[PDB]
UniProtKB/Swiss-Prot annotation, chain A:
Residues where Phosphoserine is found: S22
Positions bound to Zn(2+): C18, C21, C36, C39
UniProt similarity note: Belongs to the universal ribosomal protein uS14 family.
Single GO cellular component term: cytosol
Keyword NADP: no
Superkingdom assignment: Eukaryota
Obligatory cofactor(s): Zn(2+)
Oligomeric and partner information: Component of the small ribosomal subunit (SSU). Mature yeast ribosomes consist of a small (40S) and a large (60S) subunit. The 40S small subunit contains 1 molecule of ribosomal RNA (18S rRNA) and 33 different proteins (encoded by 57 genes). The large 60S subunit contains 3 rRNA molecules (25S, 5.8S and 5S rRNA) and 46 different proteins (encoded by 81 genes).
Protein name: Small ribosomal subunit protein uS14A
Cofactor note (record): Binds 1 zinc ion per subunit.
Keywords: Cytoplasm, Metal-binding, Phosphoprotein, Ribonucleoprotein, Ribosomal protein, Zinc
Gene3D superfamilies: 30s Ribosomal Protein S14, Chain N
GO terms for MF: structural constituent of ribosome; zinc ion binding
Swiss-Prot record, chain B:
Domain of life of the source: Eukaryota
Pfam families given in the database record: Ribosomal_S10 (PF00338)
Free-text description of this protein's post-translational modifications in UniProt: N-terminally acetylated by acetyltransferase NatA. Also partially acetylated by NatC.
Protein family per UniProt: Belongs to the universal ribosomal protein uS10 family.
Protein known as: Small ribosomal subunit protein uS10
Gene3D superfamilies from the UniProt entry: Ribosomal protein S10 domain
Cellular compartments annotated: Cytoplasm
Protein source organism: Saccharomyces cerevisiae (strain ATCC 204508 / S288c)
GO biological process, one term: cytoplasmic translation
Broad class of the protein's primary localization: cytoplasm
Keywords, comma-separated and alphabetical: Acetylation, Cytoplasm, Isopeptide bond, Ribonucleoprotein, Ribosomal protein, Ubl conjugation
InterPro entries: Ribosomal_uS10, Ribosomal_uS10_CS, Ribosomal_uS10_dom, Ribosomal_uS10_dom_sf, Ribosomal_uS10_euk/arc
Reported function: Component of the ribosome, a large ribonucleoprotein complex responsible for the synthesis of proteins in the cell. The small ribosomal subunit (SSU) binds messenger RNAs (mRNAs) and translates the encoded message by selecting cognate aminoacyl-transfer RNA (tRNA) molecules. The large subunit (LSU) contains the ribosomal catalytic site termed the peptidyl transferase center (PTC), which catalyzes the formation of peptide bonds, thereby polymerizing the amino acids delivered by tRNAs into a polypeptide chain.
GO MF annotation list: mRNA binding; structural constituent of ribosome
Curated annotation (Swiss-Prot), chain E:
GO molecular function: DNA-(apurinic or apyrimidinic site) endonuclease activity; RNA binding; structural constituent of ribosome
Signal peptide start and end residues: none
Keywords, comma-separated and alphabetical: Cytoplasm, Isopeptide bond, Methylation, Phosphoprotein, Ribonucleoprotein, Ribosomal protein, RNA-binding, Ubl conjugation
Protein name per its UniProtKB record: Small ribosomal subunit protein uS3
Cross-link Glycyl lysine isopeptide (Lys-Gly) (interchain with G-Cter in ubiquitin) residue location(s): K104, K130, K139, K149
Biological role: Component of the ribosome, a large ribonucleoprotein complex responsible for the synthesis of proteins in the cell. The small ribosomal subunit (SSU) binds messenger RNAs (mRNAs) and translates the encoded message by selecting cognate aminoacyl-transfer RNA (tRNA) molecules. The large subunit (LSU) contains the ribosomal catalytic site termed the peptidyl transferase center (PTC), which catalyzes the formation of peptide bonds, thereby polymerizing the amino acids delivered by tRNAs into a polypeptide chain.
GO cellular component: 90S preribosome; cytoplasm; cytosol; cytosolic small ribosomal subunit; nucleus; preribosome, small subunit precursor
Gene encoding the protein: RPS3
Full-length numbering of the shown residues: 3 to 170 of 240
Any one GO BP annotation for this protein: cytoplasmic translation
Family, similarity comment: Belongs to the universal ribosomal protein uS3 family.
Segments forming domain KH type-2: 19-90
From Swiss-Prot, chain F:
Basic and acidic residues biased stretches: 8-25, 37-52, 59-72
Section covered of the full-length record: 53 to 141 of 273
Family of this protein: Belongs to the SERBP1-HABP4 family.
Cross-link Glycyl lysine isopeptide (Lys-Gly) (interchain with G-Cter in ubiquitin): residue positions: K69
More about this protein: Present with 46842 molecules/cell in log phase SD medium.
Function: Ribosome preservation factor that protect a small pool of nontranslating, vacant ribosomes in cells under nutrient starvation conditions. Under nutrient-limiting conditions, cells reduce ribosome biogenesis and degrade ribosomes via autophagy (ribophagy) or proteasomal degradation. To avoid excessive degradation during starvation, STM1 binds to and protects 80S ribosomes from proteasomal degradation. Under nutrient-sufficient conditions, TORC1 phosphorylates and inhibits STM1 to prevent formation of dormant 80S ribosomes.
Protein name: Suppressor protein STM1
Subcellular location: Cytoplasm; Nucleus; Cytoplasm, Perinuclear region
Top-level taxonomy: Eukaryota, Fungi, Dikarya, Ascomycota, Saccharomycotina
Reported modifications of this chain: Phosphorylation by TORC1 upon nutrient replenishment inhibits STM1 and causes its release from dormant ribosomes.
Length: 53, 107, 96, 57, 168, 89
RNA sequence: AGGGCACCACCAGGAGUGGAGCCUGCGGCUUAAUUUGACCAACACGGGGAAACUCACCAGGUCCAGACACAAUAAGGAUUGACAGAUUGAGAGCUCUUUCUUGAUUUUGUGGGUGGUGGUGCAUGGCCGUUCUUAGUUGGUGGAGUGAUUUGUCUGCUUAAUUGCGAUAACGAACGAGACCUUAACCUACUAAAUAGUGGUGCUAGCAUUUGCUGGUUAUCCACUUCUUAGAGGGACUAUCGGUUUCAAGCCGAUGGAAGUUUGAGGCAAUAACAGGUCUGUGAUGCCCUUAGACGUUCUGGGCCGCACGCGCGCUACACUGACGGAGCCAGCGAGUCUAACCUUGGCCGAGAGGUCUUGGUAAUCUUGUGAAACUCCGUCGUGCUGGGGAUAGAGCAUUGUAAUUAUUGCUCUUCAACGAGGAAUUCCUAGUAAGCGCAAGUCAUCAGCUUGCGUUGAUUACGUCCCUGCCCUUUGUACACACC
């Protein structure tokens, strides 16, 4: 019920975090992954993104 | 309930073209032995979801880039069919891996 | 700090009634989904139970999974004063 | 830091005993939580009424 | 449900990855190896491939009711719209995940690595595998770290046969 | 006695053409010069670890027979405890 | 010492860069702070285009989100929150004034936790970069040697290749190369399609006319698949024929062919390493440091952009093979919103930026034929820093955003700098390639001079060598093996 503990977080880097590791930089937003690039390289195969060429 | 057509369209979306064309072959064979008039399985252009990343987790090294792809294949089969005997065999042997949507129409 | 008695009760009776609680690791969310209280109250009440036993916690992609132990059911039955050994809550209650 | 909480009884009320009836003034309010509020300097401490409070003492 | 196909299939992949790490963290002391999700009309079934089904299924349905309730509460399913089955990994020695977990639980029990890694290598190789490799990297009673390999048999390293015939 | 913008507009020794009088230090024409890597090989901790710690960490060469033989024994144990408990007992 | 290989080497050249102005990164300097890592393989790199957030830094202000255990203090109130005033950037009961509210949830201590973009990448894992995508690596049996080891794995020729042919105390194999997978190129052969088109016309409708250009209805049409799509296949194997070679492996030429540069381009990629980078991607992590006056967390403001200067990647130019004006007029890869405001057509208003009313699209359907730019034609200019160039700066109008000042960006008018082709040096590159040209995506509320891809226009020069540079092999020398640091 305290009115001083938050500031607007509706846009920009501070409004979005990685869904795995809560990071703000390097976030991949295309197709709504909302995963950082380092967690995406770990999780790409068990999402369905594969290296073909 | 006595041989009345519905004008349905079944859209089949998957990432695995073996399983997907197996399901579409089964649908085409079902219509081809129930004598249903059907437009054949129309194949949409396969969509490629490309994600380009740097390989490094820090920012050191030669700037090496990875292109990952997800490939999405889409078919649709139109039918004019009796729904109450189509759905007596539709709801069984449910396909895994392939997203199916059946939309009725009056066009 | 002051988590009031009504809010601790409605955390602990959801935990008994469903067996498990999932919380998003989102302090300042200030309303947990399916418990009628703040997300941080849910997190810290379940932390308080975890540290004295009574629930096992797991983290997994910013979402805080809590499950009751067997010491947990014998503590929450004493605490919330439910009928003695009639109620598992909820494993297993309704499917056998 | 906070209040030291002197060991109060029922207060701001005179007596039941003194010659020879009950002595409680300040007739009842629509406030159910009746009981006197705080009086600091020409104000009272509104706690139950969410919006409207028009009496000043 | 008014979502694109490009975003729906990606979100299905993210759901699979999140369940995979959730069961990897939960069911690690009873040898979970894999998970397979089948989305059907008004049911989605979650098959857990584990080396020990009895400690996935608990007793009288405990620890599978817990996982069904945990999964449906996190992913906001209505109850009875998602079900969890367990089945046992046949040919356990051909699973690289299960052997990595068995080596991990060997090394947390205080057992030497040239005993443990070779005892995984021979077990895989007489489980009916074409080749096996174990690499152990880190520090062991010395500050200066080294890595060491334990390979028997035949391995391919290049090409599409790696994606076909190699578990890692 | 103010300061700030009022003091900055009447601040002497300030401005581009007053820095332009003052010639550039020679620190401005250097580079980091190999970041202490001409002795990267030589471990500066000064340990040069003994043989006993390495041997009882990774196994020594004297006990390879005893390593391999009980590795064989426990691999056989895993083979038996798989093979006898599939559709038996 | 010898022999190889490679436009991250050279040759023959092209296009540059280095000079100019801006842009961005690094150093230095300055600063309250200008957070920091990195010095071929750092320097438009950390996806790092930071107004807040990000944020790690600086000046200040809260909160505990200090579990649990134990001991005190509580019910005669342990504790909690607050109107208004002082206070404060603050509409923070932060703290007081004051007196209300509260009710084993605390508070105060001691252990013990917890959090940390705090340290150590020289304690580590994982991932990545590099050696090196170079061609390298290994064992079985046999030979040699007391042995460590060695031969196989090689003089030559060949190949992109330890690729083969050959030679042969070795023979027969395995990893890597190749095969493979993905993509591009061909298929009037198959399967088809109102989410792709085409031809007719059941239908009609125009304009010039007497058939040319069109606009529209798929149980309020018929048919087809050439073009497009994507399934199944086919196809190239260097075929064939000459020449050359040890009549080998192969190489060159010609013809055929969609294709004869591994058919083009990638993905994957051995043995081992490096004190390579990353503890600041992670609820990856040992240890240490910190933990209520916090290095936790949050809020406000500032900073990361600060400017005598040195360096790197770039953008814009120095014009007539051009600028300007008008007119012509053509792509391909993407992306997109209700699991809430995304891509936006059309209509209207405005010089413009933009506003507004609607619409379509969860997408081969609609944005979108993304009518892109270079380009082409016709004009204006006319060798003058000029109508080249558009830095710097003034004033105004808009948009995004809680917030634009240290100009976010866009528009309009004005201002109109250097720069006349760039020493020394240095980069990339062998065909749909270089170069020119734009477009989409990424990050994104806004911001592209950046990157990732895409297509448009499309050359010159060589099809070589070991001279330079780097790497590899062999021989050789070694008092080195932590291996020349
Ligand atoms: Mg191979
Ligand atoms: Mg290969
Ligand atoms: Mg060579
Ligand atoms: Mg040259
Ligand atoms: Mg320059
Ligand atoms: Mg700085
Ligand atoms: Mg460092
Ligand atoms: Mg940059
Ligand atoms: Mg932060
Ligand atoms: Mg500092
Ligand atoms: Mg911090
Ligand atoms: Mg951390
Ligand atoms: Mg280290
Ligand atoms: Mg290192
Ligand atoms: Mg490392
Ligand atoms: Mg050998
Ligand atoms: Mg021998
Ligand atoms: Mg040899
Ligand atoms: Mg040799
Ligand atoms: Mg090669
Ligand atoms: Mg065709
Ligand atoms: Mg180092
Ligand atoms: Mg790391
Ligand atoms: Mg650490
Ligand atoms: Mg960083
Ligand atoms: Mg701040
Ligand atoms: Mg910067
Ligand atoms: Mg660069
Ligand atoms: Mg023109
Ligand atoms: Mg087009
Ligand atoms: Mg249009
Ligand atoms: Mg001029
Ligand atoms: Mg500003
Ligand atoms: Mg600024
Ligand atoms: Mg953009
Ligand atoms: Mg910006
Ligand atoms: Mg950038
Ligand atoms: Mg040379
Ligand atoms: Mg020596």
């Amino acid at each position: 019920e305290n009115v001083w503990f938050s500031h607007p977080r509706r846009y920009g880097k501070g409004s979005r975090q990685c869904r795995v590791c809560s990071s703000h930089t390097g976030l991949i937003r295309k197709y709504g992954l909302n995963i950082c690039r380092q967690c995406f390289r770990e999780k790409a195969n068990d999402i369905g993104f594969n290296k073909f060429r | 309930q006595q041989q009345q057509i519905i004008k349905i369209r079944i859209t089949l979306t998957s990432t695995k073209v073996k399983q997907l064309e197996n399901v579409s072959s089964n649908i085409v064979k079902n219509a081809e032995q129930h004598n249903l008039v059907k437009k054949g399985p129309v194949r949409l252009p396969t969509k490629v979801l490309k994600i380009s990343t740097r390989k490094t987790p820090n920012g050191e090294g030669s700037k090496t880039w990875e292109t990952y792809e997800m490939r999405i294949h889409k078919r649709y089969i139109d039918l004019e069919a009796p729904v109450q005997i189509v759905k007596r065999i539709t709801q069984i042997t449910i396909e895994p891996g392939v997203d199916v949507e059946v939309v009725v129409a009056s066009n | 700090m002051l988590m009031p008695k009504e809010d601790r009760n409605k955390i602990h009776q959801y935990l008994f009634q469903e067996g498990v609680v999932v919380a998003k690791k989102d302090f300042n969310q200030a309303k947990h989904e399916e418990i009628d209280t703040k997300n941080l109250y849910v997190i810290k009440a379940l932390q308080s139970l975890t540290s004295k036993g009574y629930v096992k916690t797991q983290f997994s992609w910013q979402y805080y999974y809590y499950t009751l132990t067997e010491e947990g059911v014998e503590y929450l039955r004493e605490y919330l004063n439910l009928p003695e050994h009639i109620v598992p809550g909820t494993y297993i209650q309704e499917r056998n | 830091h906070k209040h030291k909480a002197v060991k109060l009884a029922v207060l701001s009320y005179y007596k039941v005993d003194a010659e020879g009836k009950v002595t409680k003034l300040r007739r009842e309010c629509s406030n159910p939580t009746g009981v006197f509020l705080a009086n600091h300097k020409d104000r009272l401490y509104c706690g139950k009424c969410h919006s409207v409070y028009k009496v000043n003492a | 449900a008014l979502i694109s196909k490009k975003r729906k299939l990606v979100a299905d992949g993210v759901f699979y990855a999140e369940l995979n790490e959730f069961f990897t963290r939960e069911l690690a002391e009873e040898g979970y190896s894999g998970v397979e999700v089948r989305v059907t009309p008004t049911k989605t079934e979650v098959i857990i491939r584990a080396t020990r089904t009895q400690d996935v299924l608990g007793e009288n349905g405990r620890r599978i009711n817990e996982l069904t309730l945990l999964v449906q509460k996190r992913f906001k399913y209505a109850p009875g719209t998602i079900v969890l089955y367990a089945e046992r990994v046949q040919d356990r020695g051909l699973s690289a995940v299960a052997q990595a977990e068995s080596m991990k639980f060997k090394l947390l029990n205080g057992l030497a690595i040239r005993r443990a890694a070779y005892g995984v290598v021979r077990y895989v190789m007489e489980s009916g595998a074409k080749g096996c490799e174990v690499v152990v990297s880190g520090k062991l009673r010395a500050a200066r770290a080294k890595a060491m390999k334990f390979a028997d048999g035949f391995l391919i390293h290049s090409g599409q046969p790696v994606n076909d015939f190699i578990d890692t | 006695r103010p300061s700030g913008n009022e003091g900055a507009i009447r601040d002497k020794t300030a401005g581009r053409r007053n820095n332009r009088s003052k010639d550039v230090t020679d620190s401005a024409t250097t580079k980091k010069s190999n970041t202490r890597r001409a002795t990267d090989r030589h471990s500066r901790t000064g340990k040069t670890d003994t043989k006993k710690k390495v041997n009882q960490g990774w196994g020594d060469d004297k006990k390879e027979l005893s390593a391999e033989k009980e590795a064989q024994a426990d691999a056989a144990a895993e083979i038996a405890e798989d093979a006898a408990e599939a559709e038996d007992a």
